[PDB]
Structures are given as C-alpha cells and as structure tokens.
Amino acid sequence: KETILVNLVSEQTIPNVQFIKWYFNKKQTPMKILLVSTKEMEQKEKSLFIKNALHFSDSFVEWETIHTDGNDISKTENILTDYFRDNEYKNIIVNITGGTKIMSLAAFDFFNNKPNTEIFYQPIGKELQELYPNKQKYDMFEVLSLKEYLDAHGISYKYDNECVKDWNYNKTVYDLCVADNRELIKGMIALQNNSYFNNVYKRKDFLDFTQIEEEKFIAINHPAATKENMIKILQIFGFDVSRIEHKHIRYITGGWFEEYVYQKICNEYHNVDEKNVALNVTIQKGNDKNELDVIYLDKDNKLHVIECKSFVDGNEGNRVLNDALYKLQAIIKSKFGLYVKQHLYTKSIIEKETPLNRAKEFGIDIKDGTQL
Amino acid sequence: KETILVNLVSEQTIPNVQFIKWYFNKKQTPMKILLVSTKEMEQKEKSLFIKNALHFSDSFVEWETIHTDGNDISKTENILTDYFRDNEYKNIIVNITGGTKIMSLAAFDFFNNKPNTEIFYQPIGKELQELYPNKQKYDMFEVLSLKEYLDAHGISYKYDNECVKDWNYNKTVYDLCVADNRELIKGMIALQNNSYFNNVYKRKDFLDFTQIEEEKFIAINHPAATKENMIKILQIFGFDVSRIEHKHIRYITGGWFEEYVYQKICNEYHNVDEKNVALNVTIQKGNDKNELDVIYLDKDNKLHVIECKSFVDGNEGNRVLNDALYKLQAIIKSKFGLYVKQHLYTKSIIEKETPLNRAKEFGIDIKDGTQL
C-alpha cells in the first residue's frame, strides 16, 4: 500500500522473479506489485507465472496487471499517468528490464525525475544497475529453487528421488554387474516391454519369478529372455527373486544409470546444490506432459536436462540424436518454453565421425564412457 | 554532408538495410550515415554487412561507426554529445530500432525535441513508426534482392541456374523416365562415386560410353552396373552416349529433381520472383563453405532453403532428418547466421508414424510425392 513495485513483463520471466525477490528480501514490508504487460504476454499468462513463483500472501503483497500496446509510446504513458494520478505512494520502485523497447522507453520517461522513485535495469549476466536517482551497480543474485524456476514457467512437476541402490553401490555397479552381463540385461529389457509382465504389474506389486511358467518367458521371444537367465540377472543385482517389484526390473533395464547420474551430481558436482536436483521427473504444462531423466538448476540459476542412455550401440546414433533433439527443441523449448542446457550421458564410447558426435554443434554436451 | 542518418546496430541487420534503402530511395541526396555500435556487434562486422548490402559509392554516402557501451546510458549520451557538438546538419534522421534497450533509451532522449530531427522505430512485422516530431506510421517495405540479403549477413555465394532439361521436360520426366527404372538409376548412382569415373572427369570433359571396357563397369560393383544398362538409361534420358558429360550423369543421379524444384518455383510459385531463385548454390562466410540445392528470397524478404532428396526410401528416415537438421541448425543458422525457412522436398511418400514425419515439429515443412 505504501510501497509499489513496477515491473514490465517479458517472455522470459526469471529476471522479474529475481528482481522482485531481491527487493522484498531486502525490505521485507507490505507492498503492491504492478505488472505492465501486453495482450501477447497475458495470453501466455506471464503475469500469473510471476505471481506463482513468489508465493506471497495476498494479505502482504497485492498484485495488479495493466495492459498496454507494446509498440505505442503514448498508450504506455497514458496508462501510467492514469494509474499514478493522485497517488500517495511513499516509494515507487521501477524495473524497466522487461517489456518491449517502447515500453521501457515510455516507462523511463514517465518515472525519470519523479519524486520518491527508483529506476532499475538488469542486463543479462551483468550487475543490476540503478539508473535514477543515484547511478550505481549492485551484485544482485538471488538463487532460485527448482520449484520457483518451474513455477516461473507455468510448469508443475512430479519426481521420485528415492533410489533402489545407494551411491556406494551405483559407483561400482557398472564394473561388477553391468559390463559383463550386457546380453542378460537385453533380455530383461524385452521382459519389461512384454505385454504379460506389463499387464500383471497393474494388478499386483510383487512378482515371484520362481513361480512363473516357462511359456510366459518364451512369449517374450528374446533368446536371452529365459526363466533361468532372468533369475540369474536378478540375483546378480542382489534382488529377492521371490518378491520382484517393477522398480527392480526398471533398475536393471537402465534405471541404474539414471540413479548413477543423479547421485553423482548430488555427490560430486560443485556448482549445484542437491536440493535442486531431481530424478524421474514428469513435467506438465496444460495438456502437455513429458518425462525427464535428470534435471537440475545449478548455482547460477541455469537449468540442465540430461538424457540418460546407458548404451548407444552401433547403427543407432541417428535415432537417439533425433529423440534427444526432439525432446530438447520440439518439446522442452517449443511446448514448455524452457531454455535449458541439454546433455546426453552415456556409458558407451562415442567415436568421432559418427552421428552422435554432431551433438556438440546442436548445443548438446555429451559425457562419454571416457568421462563416466 | 548536410543530411545525416543515425542507426543503432543490431544483430539482425535487415531492418537497418531496409530503413536506409527506404530513406535514400525517397530522398536520393548525398548523406552521411552514422552507425552506433558496440564491441560485440562490431566483432561480427555488423557495420560492414550493413554497408556492403547497400552498395553506395563513398562519394555520395559517407559511413562512420562509433562505439559505445550497450548497457551504459551515459556513455551513449556522451558519444552522441561529442559527435554532434557544433554540428551543421540540416536534417538529422534517427532510427532507434536497433541496438540494446539502453542505447535506444539514450539515443531517444538525446534527439527528442531537438530541432531538424526526425526519430523512427520499426517493430517487427509492423509498420514503420515516426515518433518525433509527428506521430504517424508508413507502409514501409523495400524488396531486397537475394544478393543484398546475403551480403547483409556477410555471405558470398556462387550458383548455376543452367539446367540440363527445360521445364516442359522436367514436368514429366519422373513419370516417363524415373519411376519405372529406379533400379538402373541406382546403378549410375554407384557409377558416379566410383573412383574411376570420378578420376577421369578430372582430366577431360567428355567421356564416350561406347569405348569404356566392361571391368571399368564391374569395378563399380553394383549389380545393375552392367555397361549396357547404363548405356540404356543414358539413352532413356536422351543423352548422346558418344559424349556423356559429368553433368548428364549428375542429372540422372538426382539433378533432375533439383531442376524440377528450381523450375517449378520459377514457373508456379506466386510469392517469389524468379530473379531471386538460385540453384546449385555454394555459400561462403570466412573459412566456411556449404552447398544448398535450391534457395529463394520470396516477396516478403523471407529466405527459403530446400533440401532436394529425390527418394527417401527404405528406413533411412532418421538419417536424412539429422542431415536436414544439421544443415539448417548447425551449419546455416549457427555458422552462417541465417534465419531461414527450410523445406524438404521428395518424390517419395512420407508415411505417418515415421521419423521424417516429425520434421514439422522441428520447423521443416515437407512436400511429399502427394504434393509433387
């Protein structure tokens, strides 16, 4: 009521969330927040995502959005004049970073040399600037949580950070279990995709593999997928063959590598806090849903998405590159509006002069078996 | 000398080219053009690309670039004050479309209410706006040549619009010669990239198919490569087996489809002038070279790039999608800085549930055999 904070709305909302978070945490007093937006921005509910990212109580922070023509300098002057006519605000705090160029122009002329007003601008990756009344710069970096970041994009998500095996196990699981058993695992992959085993796990939580008929295993039609081979590979990974959960089957079929990456990040990656790492994530925006192996927001508020493919065998580089590019560009960026750093992690060795080694030129960093 | 034009440089240079072209063609008078740039823009020779796309004589249009800090409102105010101190211009024309937000902020406030000064702004896709001294808009669209467009990206190019067959021929060459000899064409496919024929066309321009001995023919080792059926399919396409040129070979291997597309655009596409269509193009920027099948600048100054794959048979779908994506994003966009509309034209039918059926979600519009 006594302090109003003015933000211009832009497609990328994280800077606005950071500026509001930086001012509120430094003052910690009731205020009103005015968002100056457009028809195009509000059609994407950008004002809503900003609000939700902050999680203020409406008893302490009042929100209001006003619409302007993004290319009409007089319209923005008029609506700001109208809004502030006969105002008794003790502090006006203006952030002209967002919005169109004309909006920032109109906002700057209106608030420049205005009593009790502070104007700010934030260039990408640079220090926050005050432009009026005292030109100076601030080290301004509010780190966000993963949920605030996704709330800022209008994205709800669910994740499962519970791991079948711990980090001590997953450090050496590839050498002691996966490397010398590649053929047995491929039969388990076929077993997981088989209609009988997929269906029966919707009815019950535990299977007993000793009690299953051999014709149920022959139906998989994978030469590795025999009842004895599946029992063997399940015992190799230290599971109780009398009470096998789907969780365990997923671990063998490549989940071990998702856990290895998740745990390694949390235990070894320095520019990231483990509270901002998430495994087995499904993101949702409106009617779009997608699953992501590992995602984390590093300490510089940059979001990283990893595609975990335990093995990229021969003659499949082209397929897995499109799948990855399809997830990155068509889905994550185009349908969800997320500007992420994308990675492909694999235990296989990516030779040069192969399709997958183009990924660097698409913006996808690949970590190889030589890296893992 | 008496009229000056002030433009702020942005990464996408076409708006500046169009505004400069629009004003000179309206006034046609000696003028000075002042480009306000930054170290980042000038590291890309953006001022050079603007100059080179206009092709003015230095006797009539004087160019000068001054450098500022993109996020420092006072440095821009300072360099403009210094430059225009005791100036004698009769007309000052300012275009604040380009540059960063802070540069446009600083340029606008410096030139606003100045005498003999006009200020302009162009939002994307919208009419040009005069902001000062009279608010109004203009139908503003300067059609560009393909050369001006590519010069504006610092790209030189070579091409070859001489076709082997005319449009009347290529209109029906698929039905009457390609469709029912797919097997013989793959035999010349392998003949072209055979080392012997590749070798000899280095030395001479005409090779007489009558006098080549038949183990030159089986060294290709393709089953259909039997000296007589390459004579036969050379005759089917109407060529002089006495004096086959390499160009005739290329025509059968797929060049017929590139000529078909090129000529169909020139003859049938409404929104494109044929003087802006080029075939068999090589583009060059620095030490980067690449070849494109057919490119054209339409009448909306939108650049289109077409990958001509006559047949996309089998289950080679993932491969041609990466090759297309690699060309559009890795090469054309990232190395050449071109924001183009890309197409993939093919005589085959792209079924649904196929890799290439994803292409539209990547922005690649595909014209099938249904449409061709």
CATH of the domain at B141: 3.40.50.10770
Whether the CB of A358 is below 8 Å from some CB of chain B: the reply is yes
The response to whether A308 counts as a known ligand-binding position is: yes
Q: How far apart are alpha carbons A343 and B201 in whole angstroms? A: 45
Neighbours of A31 (CB within 10 A): 21
Report how far apart, in Å, the C-alpha atoms of B167 and of each of B19, B95, B309 are.
Answer: 38, 45, 19
| Burial label, A81 (beta-carbon count in 10 A; 0-12, 13-18, 19+) | exposed
Provide, as residue numbers in chain A, all residues whose Cβ is less than 8 Å from the Cβ of B358. Answer: 322, 326, 330
Interface contact A326-B361, CB threshold 8 A? yes
Of A123, A355, A361, the CB nearest to B334: A361
Helix B101-111 crosses helix B73-83 at what angle (to 10 degrees)? 40
Interface test with B, best of A72, A74, A101 (most B CBs within 10 A): A101
Angstroms from B350 CA to nearest CA on chain A: 17
Please provide the size of chain B in residues: 372
Coil vs helix vs strand at B176: helix
Chain B 36-95, residues with CB within 8 Å of chain A CB atoms = 70-71, 73-74
Shortest CA distance from B320: residue in chain A? A318
- The reply to whether A126 touches chain B by the CB within 8 Å rule is yes
* Partner-chain residue, chosen from A101, A123, A319, that has the shortest CB–CB distance to B104: A101
Q: Is beta strand B61-67 parallel, antiparallel or unpaired with respect to B31-37? A: parallel
Where is the binding site, in residues of B? 78, 82, 270, 293, 307-308
Of B101, B109, B318, the CB nearest to A322: B318
In terms of Cβ atoms closer than 10 Å to its own Cβ (0-12, 13-18, 19+), residue A283 is: buried
Cα-Cα-Cα-Cα dihedral of A6, A7, A9, A11, to 10°? -170
Contact assessment for residue B75 and residue B67, using Cβ atoms and an 8 Å cutoff: no
Q: Does B133 touch chain A (CB under 8 A)?
A: no
Contact (CB<8Å) B135/A74: yes
Q: Does A140 touch chain B (CB under 8 A)?
A: no
The whole domain housing A147 covers: 3-156
Interchain CB contact of B334 with A (< 8 Å): yes
Query: For chains A and B, what is the number of CB pairs under 8 angstroms?
Result: 70
- Pair A155, A284: CB distance under 8 Å: yes
Which one of A74, A101, A318 has the shortest CB-CB distance to B101?
Answer: A101
3-state secondary structure chain A: CCEEEEEECCCCCHHHHHHHHHHHHHHCCCEEEEEEECHHHHHCCHHHHHHHHHCCCCCCEEEEEEECCCCCHHHHHHHHHHHHCCCCCCEEEEECCCCCHHHHHHHHHHHCCCCCEEEEECCCCCCEEEEECCCEEECCCCCCCHHHHHHCCCCEEECCCCCCCCHHHHHHHHHHHHHHHHHHHHHHHHHHHCHHHHHHHHHCCCECHHHCCHHHHHCCCCCCCCHHHHHHHHHHCCCCCCCECHHHHHHHHHHHHHHHHHHHHHHHCCCCCHHHEEEEEEEEECCEEEEEEEEEECCCCCEEEEEECCCCCCCCHHHHHHHHHHHHHHHHHCCCCCCCEEEEECCCCCCCCCHHHHHHHHCEEEECCCCC
Closest CA to A296 of A306, A308, A285, A284: A306
Q: What determination technique applies here?
A: X-ray
- Distance, in Å, from the CA atom of B343 to the CA atom of B349, rounded to the nearest integer, reads 15
Picking from B104, B326, B362, the nearest residue to A105 by CB comes out as B104
**Token couple for A313:** 């065998």
**Residue B224, C-beta contacts closer than 8 angstroms, at least 6 positions apart:** B183, B184, B186, B187
Sheet (strand B288-297) strand order: B156-158, B277-285, B288-297, B303-308, B341-345, B365-367
User: In 3-state terms, what secondary structure has residue B181?
Assistant: helix
DSSP-assigned letter for residue B276: G
Look up residue A265 and give its two tokens: 């990040």
Where do the DSSP E strands lie in chain B?
A: 3-8, 31-37, 61-67, 91-95, 117-121, 128-132, 136-138, 156-158, 277-285, 288-297, 303-308, 341-345, 365-367
- Which two tokens mark B20? 């400069």
Report the greatest alpha carbon distance in chain B. Answer: 84
Q: Which two tokens mark A225? A: 């997928």
